[PDB]
């Protein structure tokens, strides 16, 4: 499953935001990936999120795959809105 | 602990090389990471590894931390060399 979002967070996807993301994704039996410009990283590691250097205004795709993918994806979109990261 | 290497694979770190690295790193409990020109990704993440686009001649550093990080490292140097990826 996949969803595209626009980052609206002011400092882009920095330390706190990569963490709330890893945290939520970590709760699911599903492989969770983050994509920006053709580059994809596993979402369950802050290392590789920090590395993409995603700033405000960017568009990114979140994909999930596995037993719990619908729930995994719905949760991530809830954190993106609720943590004022994107929409 | 860490180890730096020089990539000598003509195609850099492409799908095959990334695959051998990841399979090797995955047998260990230590957290295992790859860094290239300031960007760091989890070595147990095929996606993140490919995202880096490491070409022939670059230098990369492999880091391993935890329980069996000396064996994780020797093991990765060995793959580095027997799989013709670098030295």
CATH superfamily of chain A: HPr-like
Straight-line distance between termini of chain A = 17 Å
Number-wise, the strands of chain A total 4
Indicate the CATH topology of chain A.
Histidine-containing Protein, Chain: A
Biggest chain pair interface? A-B, 11 and 10 residues
Main pleated-sheet profile of chain A = 4 strands, antiparallel
Widest sheet, order of strands of chain A? 1-4-2-3
Total number of domains of chain A: 1
Reported CATH architecture of chain A: 2-Layer Sandwich
Multimeric status of the protein: homodimer
CATH classification class of chain A:
Alpha Beta
Q: What series of H and E elements makes up the topology of chain A?
A: EHEEHEH
Q: Can you characterise this structure?
A:
Two copies of one chain form a homodimer. The first copy, chain A, has a single domain, classed as HPr-like (Histidine-containing Protein, Chain: A, 2-Layer Sandwich), CATH 3.30.1340.10. In chain A, 37% of the residues lie in helices and 25% in strands. Chain A has a four-stranded antiparallel sheet with strand order 1-4-2-3, covered by helices on one side. Chain A is of the alpha+beta class and 87 residues long. Chain A is globular, with a radius of gyration of 11 Å. In chain A, a hairpin with a 2-residue loop joins strand 2 and strand 3 (39-42). Chain A starts with a strand and ends in a 5-residue tail after the last helix. Chain A has three helices and four strands. At the A-B interface, strand 3 and helix 2 of A face strand 3 and helix 2 of B. Chains A, B: The modification Phosphoserine is found at residues 11, 45. Chains A, B: Residues 1-87 form the HPr domain. Chains A, B: Belongs to the HPr family. Chains A, B: Keywords: Cytoplasm, Phosphoprotein, Phosphotransferase system, Sugar transport, Transcription, Transcription regulation, Transport.
